[PDB]
C-alpha cells in the first residue's frame, strides 16, 4: 500500500529525497515555531518519522489544504472576474506591459553575470542555458502573458520534465499549470517534548488534481477521485508576498481592488438603471364599472382602453417612432367617459426618470478604484508617482524572476555543470536584468543632466578658487574618480 509517485516523476522525487536527506542532518533544531515565512501551507501530522507513503501523505496533504482550497479557487475566479471588467484590465495592462517589454532589435530580459567565478566558461554556459530557459517558457513571445496571469493570481506553476533514462539532457519546454488544480503543503511528522522542535524538512508536497471538477465557466467534468502527489523539484513556481490574515492564504495583486471594483460596478449600474426605469410617460387608466364582475366589467374597460390605445413603439435601429401617423399630433388628446354623474373615473399618473444629478459619487468611487488598482494616477516628466511605480515594477520583477532562476539553477545541476553547493555559496547575486524603455530612460537622464549642467554653470565664477574640478565632477556631475580620470585622459587624446 506504500505507493510511490508515478514513475515519470521519480527522478524529481529522487532529487528531493537527497535534498531532504541532507536537510534532516542540519542543525536547525530546537525551534519552537516552524522555520517558515511563505509559500506552501504547513500542517502538524502523525509524528511518525518517515512514514510518508502515497496514501498517508494524501490524507494529511488533503486535510491540510482542504479547509480553504475552495476559497483559493474562489479567489482565482474573483481576480479573473475583475480582470474581465473594464477599468481594471487596463491597470493590469499598464503594469504587465511595463514589467515586461520586448523591443525593436533589442535584447530581452537577461541574466547578468558580473561576479567572480572559477572559470569564465561558466558565464557562457549559464548564459547559454538561460537563453534556453526562455525558450522553454517561450518568454520571447508569451513572457508577458505568463506574467499577467501570475500577477492577477499572485502565483504561477510549471511542470518540469526529464528523459527519464538520460535525465541530464531531458530538459525541455515547461508546461504552465493553472493553480485551480494545484495544492502545496509543508508537513511535520516528528515529535519531542511539548511539541516538535526537531529539524523539519516538511517535504514541500504538491498535489495535482485530476478531473476538471471545479470550474469558472461551464463544460465541467465528473468527480476527480484520487489526486497525484508531486515532488517540488518538479515544479517551477513563483508567487507574491501578499497573503491574507491567516496561514498561507495567498492573495492577488488586485485583491485590494475587489471591494471597490465590484462597488463601482454596482454604482455604475445603479446610474444606468435609474435613468432608464421610468424614462417614458407612466400612468394607470381607471374605468368605473358598477355592478359587474371582472369577467364582464372588462368589456367596459376594453371600450375605452382599446379605443384610446396609442399603439406606439420606438425603432432603436433607426431613431423613429415606428409607423407613426400622422407624424406628430399637436396634443395627446385623450378622453374618459363617466357613466355616473360623479368625478371618479380618472388617470393615475407616475413620475419619470428626471435628470437631477449631481452625478458626483460615481467619480469619488471611480477615483478610489482607479487608485486601488495600482497608480500612477497620471493616466486617464519624472515625478514621485513614476519613481515609486518603477520601484514596484522591480519588486514584481524580482518575484516573477524565480521562474527563470529555478529551471536555470536546476538545469545547470541536472546537466552536471555547477554543484548545488557551489551555486549556494557563490550567489550572492544571479540577477536577471530587464530591458527598459529607452524613450523614457533617455528623457530621465537628459533632464537630470540639464540640472547638473546648469549647476556646473553656477559653480563656474567661483570654481577657480572655491571648488576643485574633481569636486565639481563628483558632486555635480556625480562622476566616479575613475570616470573622471578616464575623461581627462580622453580629453587630452581628443586634441588630435
Partner 1 sequence: LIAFDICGVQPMNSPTGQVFALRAVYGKDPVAAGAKEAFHPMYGPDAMFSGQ
Partner 2 sequence: KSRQLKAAYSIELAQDLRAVHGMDADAELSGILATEIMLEINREVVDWINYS
Q: Does 55 bind partner 2 (CB under 8 A)?
A: yes
Beta bridge partners of 43: 187
DSSP H or E segment with residue 465: helix 438-466
Q: Which does 494 bind (CB under 5 to 8 A by kind): partner 2, partner 1, none?
A: none
Q: Which does 453 bind (CB under 5 to 8 A by kind): partner 2, partner 1, none?
A: none
- The CA dihedral of 140, 146, 148, 152, to the nearest 10 degrees, is -170
Q: How far apart are CA 353 and CA 356, in angstroms?
A: 9
Q: Which is nearer to partner 2, 188 or 432 (CB)?
A: 188
Q: Least separation, in Å, of the C-beta of 189 and partner 2?
A: 12
Q: Does 192 bind partner 1 (CB under 8 A)?
A: no
Mark 184-223 with x for binding to partner 2 (rule: CB under 8 A) and - for no binding: --------------------------------------xx
Q: How far apart are CA 224 and CA 228, in angstroms?
A: 11
Q: Does 416 bind partner 2 (CB under 8 A)?
A: no
Q: Does 367 bind partner 1 (CB under 8 A)?
A: no
Q: How far apart are CA 390 and CA 94, in angstroms?
A: 12
Q: How far apart are CA 35 and CA 147, in angstroms?
A: 29
Q: Which does 367 bind (CB under 5 to 8 A by kind): partner 1, partner 2, none?
A: none
Q: Which is nearer to partner 2, 58 or 434 (CB)?
A: 58
Q: Does 191 bind partner 1 (CB under 8 A)?
A: yes
Q: Does 8 bind partner 1 (CB under 8 A)?
A: no
From 41-49, 147-155, 213-221, 451-459, give the range in contact with partner 1 by CB under 8 A. Answer: 41-49
Q: How far apart are CA 464 and CA 37, in angstroms?
A: 58
Q: Which does 226 bind (CB under 5 to 8 A by kind): partner 2, partner 1, none?
A: partner 2
Q: Which is nearer to partner 1, 78 or 196 (CB)?
A: 196
The DSSP annotation for 342-357 comes to SS---EEEE-------
Q: Which does 55 bind (CB under 5 to 8 A by kind): partner 1, partner 2, none?
A: partner 2
Of positions 3, 21, 29, 47, contacts partner 1 by CB under 8 A: 47
Beta bridge partners of 185: 41, 205
Q: Does 272 bind partner 1 (CB under 8 A)?
A: no
Mark 102-121 with x for binding to partner 1 (rule: CB under 8 A) and - for no binding: --------------------
Cα 14 to chain centroid, rounded: 33
Residue 127: closest CA among 435, 434, 432:
432
Of positions 4, 59, 383, 480, contacts partner 2 by CB under 8 A: 59
The count of residues interacting with partner 1 (CB under 8 A) is: 5
CA distances from 434 to 106, 110, 112, 445 (A): 11, 6, 10, 18
Q: Least separation, in Å, of the C-beta of 224 and partner 2?
A: 10
- Using CB atoms within 10 Å of the CB of residue 4, give its burial: 0 to 12 exposed, 13 to 18 middle, 19+ buried: exposed
Q: What are phi and psi of 159, to 5 degrees?
A: -90, 120
Q: Which does 210 bind (CB under 5 to 8 A by kind): partner 2, partner 1, none?
A: none
Q: Does 81 bind partner 1 (CB under 8 A)?
A: no
Q: Does 67 bind partner 2 (CB under 8 A)?
A: no
Q: Which is nearer to partner 1, 191 or 475 (CB)?
A: 191
Of positions 4, 17, 24, 63, contacts partner 2 by CB under 8 A: 63
Q: Does 97 bind partner 1 (CB under 8 A)?
A: no
Q: How far apart are CA 305 and CA 303, in angstroms?
A: 6
The DSSP annotation for 276-324 comes to HTT-S-EEEE----TT--HHHHHHHHHHHHTTS-----EETTTTEETT-
From 27-35, 45-53, 360-368, 393-401, give the range in contact with partner 1 by CB under 8 A. Answer: 45-53
CB crowding 337-352: b at 16 or more within 10 Å, else e: eeeeeeeebeeeeeee
Q: Which is nearer to partner 1, 191 or 288 (CB)?
A: 191
Contacts to partner 1 by CB under 8 A: 46-48, 51, 191
The site for partner 2 (CB under 8 A) is made up of: 1-2, 46, 51, 53-59, 62-63, 222-223, 225-226
Amino acid at each position: 500500500m506504500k505507493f510511490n509517485v508515478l514513475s515519470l516523476f521519480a527522478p524529481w522525487a529522487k532529487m528531493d529525497e537527497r535534498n531532504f536527506k541532507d536537510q534532516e542532518k542540519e542543525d536547525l533544531v530546537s525551534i519552537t515555531a516552524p522555520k517558515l515565512d511563505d509559500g506552501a501551507r504547513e500542517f502538524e501530522v502523525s509524528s511518525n518519522e518517515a512514514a510518508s507513503p502515497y496514501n498517508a501523505a494524501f490524507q494529511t496533504i488533503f486535510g491540510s489544504y482542504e479547509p480553504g482550497m475552495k476559497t483559493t479557487r474562489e479567489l482565482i475566479d474573483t481576480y479573473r472576474n475583475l480582470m474581465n471588467n473594464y477599468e481594471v484590465d487596463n491597470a493590469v495592462s499598464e503594469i504587465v506591459s511595463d514589467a515586461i517589454v520586448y523591443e525593436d532589435d533589442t535584447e530581452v530580459v537577461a541574466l547578468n553575470l558580473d561576479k567572480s567565478k572559477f572559470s569564465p566558461k561558466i558565464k557562457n554556459m549559464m548564459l547559454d542555458e538561460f537563453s534556453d530557459v526562455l525558450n522553454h517558457l517561450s518568454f520571447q513571445r508569451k513572457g508577458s502573458d505568463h506574467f499577467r496571469r501570475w500577477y492577477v493570481d499572485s502565483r504561477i506553476f510549471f511542470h518540469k520534465i526529464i528523459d527519464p533514462k538520460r535525465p541530464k539532457e531531458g530538459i525541455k519546454e515547461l508546461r504552465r499549470l493553472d493553480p485551480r488544480q494545484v495544492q502545496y503543503v509543508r508537513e511535520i511528522i516528528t515529535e519531542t517534548e511539548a511539541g516538535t522542535k526537531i529539524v523539519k524538512g516538511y517535504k514541500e508536497y504538491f498535489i495535482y488534481d485530476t478531473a476538471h471538477e471545479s470550474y469558472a465557466c461551464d463544460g465541467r467534468m465528473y468527480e476527480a477521485g484520487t489526486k497525484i502527489k508531486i515532488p517540488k523539484a518538479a515544479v517551477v513556481y513563483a508567487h507574491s508576498g501578499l497573503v491574507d490574515c491567516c496561514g498561507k492564504n495567498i492573495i492577488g495583486y488586485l485583491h485590494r481592488a475587489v471591494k471597490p471594483a465590484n462597488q463601482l460596478k454596482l454604482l455604475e449600474d445603479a446610474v444606468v438603471i435609474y435613468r432608464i426605469t421610468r424614462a417614458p410617460d407612466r400612468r394607470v387608466w381607471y374605468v368605473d364599472t358598477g355592478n359587474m364582475p371582472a369577467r364582464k366589467a372588462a368589456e367596459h374597460m376594453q371600450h375605452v382602453m382599446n379605443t384610446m390605445k396609442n399603439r406606439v413603439v420606438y425603432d432603436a435601429s433607426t431613431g423613429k417612432i415606428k409607423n407613426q401617423q400622422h407624424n406628430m399630433s399637436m396634443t395627446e388628446d385623450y378622453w374618459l367617459q363617466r357613466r355616473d354623474g360623479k368625478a371618479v373615473t380618472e388617470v393615475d399618473t407616475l413620475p419619470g426618470a428626471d435628470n437631477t444629478g449631481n452625478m458626483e459619487d460615481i467619480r469619488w468611487f471611480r477615483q478610489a478604484l482607479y487608485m486601488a488598482l495600482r497608480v500612477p494616477l497620471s493616466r486617464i516628466s519624472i515625478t514621485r508617482d513614476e519613481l515609486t511605480f518603477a520601484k514596484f515594477i522591480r519588486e514584481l520583477q524580482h518575484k516573477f524572476e524565480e521562474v527563470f532562476l529555478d529551471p536555470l539553477k536546476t538545469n545547470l545541476l541536472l546537466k552536471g555543470i555547477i554543484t548545488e553547493d557551489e551555486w549556494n555559496d557563490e550567489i550572492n547575486n544571479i540577477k536577471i536584468e530587464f530591458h527598459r524603455d529607452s524613450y523614457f530612460a533617455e528623457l530621465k537622464e537628459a533632464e537630470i543632466l540639464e540640472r547638473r549642467i546648469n549647476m556646473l554653470t553656477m559653480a563656474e565664477p567661483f570654481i577657480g578658487k572655491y571648488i576643485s574640478h574633481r569636486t565639481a565632477m563628483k558632486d555635480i556631475l556625480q562622476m566616479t574618480d575613475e570616470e573622471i580620470e578616464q575623461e581627462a585622459k580622453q580629453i587630452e587624446e581628443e586634441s588630435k
